[PDB]
């Protein structure tokens, strides 16, 4: 069932949408965890490409987010 989980990008997202519409707990996790693995490893900008996102941060907020994360060991 990992073999199942290959698919296009919108065909995964759209699967999540209609996977909690019909209330399938098991499939919702499997689909979500697979988007989660797409994010793991990538840099901030490289995450913004893979999903077509647009940085909505002033450079003051960026360095604010940056200063807060410094209170957590990686």
């Amino acid at each position: 069932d990992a073999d199942f989980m290959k698919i296009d990008q919108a065909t995964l997202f759209e699967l999540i949408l209609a996977a909690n519409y019909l209330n399938i707990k098991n499939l919702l996790d499997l689909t979500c965890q697979t988007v989660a693995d797409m994010i793991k490893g990538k840099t901030p900008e490289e995450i913004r490409t893979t999903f077509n996102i647009k940085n909505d941060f002033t450079p003051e907020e960026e360095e604010e987010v940056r200063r807060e994360n410094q209170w957590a060991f990686e």
Partner: protein, 580 residues
């Protein structure tokens, strides 16, 4: 991501990575909302006493965070919110932590003096379900017996697990606290009494009442005094009264701390096991000997059908000559045998009865087994092997599972994530490459410990593509500056080294000498560096040049453990625009 916010959160729920998670925060304010909202674990990167933490945006919050670790918090060793040397500042800090971290059900802390607990517990009493205490420092002498734990057992009404595994106290603290707080301990289910591996062990006069006071105990992990030279050691009678006092036990793990036959017998261990129907994880790592244990294991199969994980110290008659004598034990997910001389190549082949269970197997100091049927247990459901002090076996040649194998503790490989090698005094790493470990495409972790009484071939590990985490333990090696050069020569050539844990050696503070700093310093890839022992203030800047080093700390986590120039260093370390 036009999707409903609850499903973005559900996505981010699944991120284990702190760094990836940290990077998701930097994508957009929308998934920064989503990351702070779903993060479950956090080990703080302090000092939380400093105004950078306190006067900090108060929508910086982790409302569904459960496990908060405050043991790693700067400076490393120091008291947290002690009221010993003033309340007002401890009051406020406490509330600040309680404001980013309001849903903590699980807390780790470094605990020099019991008033830190008294100052943290108010905010989380109603939530707190698990506690880890951590203390490599000595115990404050003046405290009165079971005083270190009174703050917890009075306040935290929902406490189910207690972890003293790295907490230096006296056994009489534990016995005093856990027998004079029945309201609290009647609820306890998990207990870990390691005590910073710095005791001779709990006696039967101690072990007995703790079980007595803890009916619901489902897990116990303890160092016990088994040496029968002493009148109050742990016998069959003591084990029996543990088992009938903690019926629910699923995970029991006794062991003798150390540096000849035990007061335990085989008909005694058969009765004992008959008392523990639920026993899933059993572990008796004792140095003293327990002869002809063959039966006791067949008992364990019959009395304890739910057993899976199993680890035996000096248990001398596990398996043998003829037919089934530990292999009655049908399921063993993992198994480890130890200083057991009666083990013989006859035995390992004879485990044709654990075809379905054993994904892990280990022998430590067995002295009578061969190469080529460590070449016989080859089957589909098997993944992880130690082989520690064999007078005879020295070989990796044996293996069908070269393709399937995943960890290895000895002294192409197509699935081998992990590797722990033990060496001697001035042994050379290098021969390892010719002796059979040449490829290792997927090898991520490697662990090297040294013990004893040209250079190390550390550079010869640069073959391995994805090798990122090393742990180099020279603590037990017993001037030192030239020795640290021998060992650290050529880490630079490890291209993909991401995370290093170094133990410098001990001679009466464990100092990390200048040539070592400069050798470590040339590591380019290091995102995390932890050094067990310390250096001088005037040696500290030199790590600041490592391009993207972020996490670094001087964690003296050894008993007895022993300056806010470190804080000056820490600011300089954070200052640098490093990678995200």
């Amino acid at each position: 991501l036009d999707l409903p916010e609850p499903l973005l959160l559900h996505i981010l729920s699944f991120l284990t990575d702190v760094r990836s998670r940290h990077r998701a925060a930097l994508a957009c304010g929308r998934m920064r909302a989503a990351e702070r909202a779903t993060r479950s674990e956090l080990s703080l990167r302090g000092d939380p006493r400093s105004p950078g933490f306190l006067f900090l945006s108060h929508a910086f919050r982790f409302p569904a965070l459960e496990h908060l670790d405050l043991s790693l918090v700067s400076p490393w060793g120091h008291p947290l919110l002690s009221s010993v040397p003033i309340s007002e500042q401890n009051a406020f800090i406490a509330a600040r932590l309680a404001g980013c971290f309001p849903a903590v059900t699980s807390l780790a802390v470094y605990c020099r003096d019991p008033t830190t607990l008294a100052n943290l517990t108010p905010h989380w009493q109603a939530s707190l379900r698990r506690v880890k205490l951590v203390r490599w420092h000595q115990r404050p002498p003046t405290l009165p017996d079971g005083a270190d734990l009174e703050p917890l057992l009075e306040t935290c009404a929902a406490l189910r697990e207690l972890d003293l595994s790295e907490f230096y106290c006296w056994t009489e603290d534990v016995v005093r606290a856990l027998t004079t707080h029945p309201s609290a301990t009647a609820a306890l289910t998990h207990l870990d009494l390691g005590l910073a591996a710095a005791t001779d062990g709990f006696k039967s006069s101690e072990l007995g009442p703790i079980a007595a006071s803890c009916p619901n105990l489902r897990k116990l992990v303890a160092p016990c005094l088994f040496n029968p030279r002493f009148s109050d050691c742990v016998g069959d009678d003591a084990l029996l009264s543990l088992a009938t006092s903690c019926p629910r036990l699923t995970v029991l793990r006794l062991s003798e701390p150390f540096e000849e036959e035990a007061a335990i017998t085989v008909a005694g261990l058969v009765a004992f096991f008959a008392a523990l129907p639920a026993l899933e994880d059993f572990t008796m790592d004792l140095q003293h000997n327990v002869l002809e244990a063959a039966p006791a294991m067949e008992a364990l199969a019959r009395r304890c059908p739910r057993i899976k994980f199993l680890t035996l110290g000096s248990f001398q008659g596990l398996c043998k000559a003829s037919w089934l004598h530990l292999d009655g034990v049908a399921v063993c997910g993992g198994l480890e045998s130890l200083y057991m001389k009666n083990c013989q190549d006859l035995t390992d082949a004879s485990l044709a009865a654990i075809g379905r269970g054993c994904r892990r197997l280990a022998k430590f100091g067995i002295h009578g087994c061969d190469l080529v049927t460590s070449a016989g247990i080859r089957r589909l459901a098997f993944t992880l092997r130690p082989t520690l002090k064999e007078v005879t076996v020295l070989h990796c040649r044996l293996l069908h599972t070269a393709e399937c194998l995943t960890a290895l503790s000895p002294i192409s490989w197509e699935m081998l994530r992990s590797l722990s090698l033990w060496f001697s005094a001035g042994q050379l790493l290098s021969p390892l490459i010719s002796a059979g470990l040449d490829s290792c495409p997927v090898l991520e972790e490697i662990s090297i410990k040294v013990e004893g009484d040209t250079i190390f071939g550390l550079s010869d590990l640069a073959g391995f593509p994805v090798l990122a985490k090393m742990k180099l333990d020279l603590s037990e090696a017993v001037d030192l500056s030239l020795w640290e050069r021998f060992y650290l020569h050529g880490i630079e050539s490890l291209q993909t080294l991401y995370e290093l844990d170094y133990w410098p050696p001990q001679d009466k503070h464990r100092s990390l000498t200048l040539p070592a700093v400069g050798l470590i310093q040339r590591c380019v890839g290091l995102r995390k560096l932890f050094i067990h022992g310390t250096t001088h203030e005037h040696f500290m800047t030199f790590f600041l040049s490592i391009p993207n080093l972020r996490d670094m700390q001087l964690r003296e986590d050894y008993y007895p453990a022993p300056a806010e120039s470190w804080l000056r260093f820490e600011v300089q370390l954070n200052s640098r625009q490093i990678d995200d």
